[PDB]
């Protein structure tokens, strides 16, 4: 059905980083969902790890479902690391750890560890949000044909 | 036909060999990542180029010719290039401005305008690629660890 499923905490990214990503995707004719069982129906899951991704249960459970569609459906998963250390996502250490379960639990740690290591986009390695989002759209678009 | 080296380090010794480069190479060794010991013919023989931009990278035509060649292999042989910005800022390398631009400009005075255009194109193309700016990492150690894991994954590419 869909080209992309986005998993993100709205408070961190919806009005800003996400709007730019979705605009670039749209302009490349990438398909997604305009606001949980839709994940199955999506070829690519773009996961936006932000500072408060670890505070939402809907986020984490969305991620577990994304992880299941990786292992069972060969859903491709692209993690974005948005002002968030990727090692802290993988190891639930530091700031991101603290937020993690101030908030089952082991299925979560398994998803975070699994997706954190995949080929992704670390804003800290990129000159700008605009350029990173550009590369991400071309990677999704050639990942979709 | 397999490539002889995982990594080709392109760097300015005077800046980095005794310090930052020795730590990065130890980390690479520790993950069984191969690299040449020190020349442009080796470059095409490497899966990954790590370009360490430092203050005096700009002052060495051997580095800049290395960079032109890395660029050629990036577009022609699908070579992966990782830039590192070691106490230079990326846009100064990308645009040849400020400190870095000044050293670069001093270097070009006795050189082909043509060569110079090559150097500018390589600098601009590599400087915008995703990479490791030390300003954006907690420490050299932390950055080198992330870079080495990155390089290791990239050796899983077919």
Swiss-Prot record, chain B:
The active site is at residue 66. Expressed in guard cells and epidermal cells, but not detected in mesophyll cells. Transmembrane segments: none annotated. NAD(+) binds at residues 12-17. Residues 3-155 form the TIR domain. Disruption phenotype: Impaired disease resistance responses. It is found in: Cytoplasm; Microsome; Nucleus. Induction: Up-regulated by salicylic acid and in mutants defective in RNA silencing. Down-regulated by high temperature. Repressed by ZED1 in the absence of pathogens in an ambient temperature-sensitive manner. Belongs to the disease resistance TIR-NB-LRR family. A gain-of-function mutant in SNC1 resulting from a point mutation leads to a dwarf and curled-leaf phenotype and a constitutive disease resistance in the absence of cell death. Homodimer. Interacts (via TIR domain) with TPR1. Interacts with EDS1. Interacts with SRFR1. Interacts with HSP90-3. Binds to MORC1/CRT1. Interacts with TRAF1B. The TIR domain mediates NAD(+) hydrolase (NADase) activity. Self-association of TIR domains is required for NADase activity. Disease resistance protein of the TIR-NB-LRR-type. Part of the RPP5 locus that contains a cluster of several paralogous disease resistance (R) genes. Resistance proteins guard the plant against pathogens that contain an appropriate avirulence protein via an indirect interaction with this avirulence protein. That triggers a defense system including the hypersensitive response, which restricts the pathogen growth. This is Protein SUPPRESSOR OF npr1-1, CONSTITUTIVE 1. It comes from Arabidopsis thaliana. The lineage of its organism: Eukaryota, Viridiplantae, Streptophyta, Embryophyta, Tracheophyta. The gene is SNC1. The chain holds residues 17 to 185 of 1437 of the full protein.
């Amino acid at each position: 059905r869909y080209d992309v499923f986005p998993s993100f905490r709205g408070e961190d990214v919806r009005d800003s980083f996400l709007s730019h990503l979705l605009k670039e995707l749209r302009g490349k004719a990438i398909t997604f969902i305009d606001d949980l069982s839709a994940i199955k129906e999506s070829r690519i899951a773009i996961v936006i790890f932000s500072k408060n991704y670890a505070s939402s249960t809907w986020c984490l459970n969305e991620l577990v479902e994304i992880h299941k569609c990786y292992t069972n459906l060969n859903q491709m998963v692209i993690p974005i690391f948005f002002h968030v250390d990727a090692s802290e996502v993988k190891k639930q250490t530091g700031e991101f750890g603290k937020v993690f379960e101030e908030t089952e639990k082991q299925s979560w740690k398994q998803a975070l560890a699994a997706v954190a290591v995949m080929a992704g986009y670390d804003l800290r390695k990129w000159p700008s949000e605009a350029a990173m989002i550009e590369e991400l759209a071309e990677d999704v678009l050639r990942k979709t044909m």
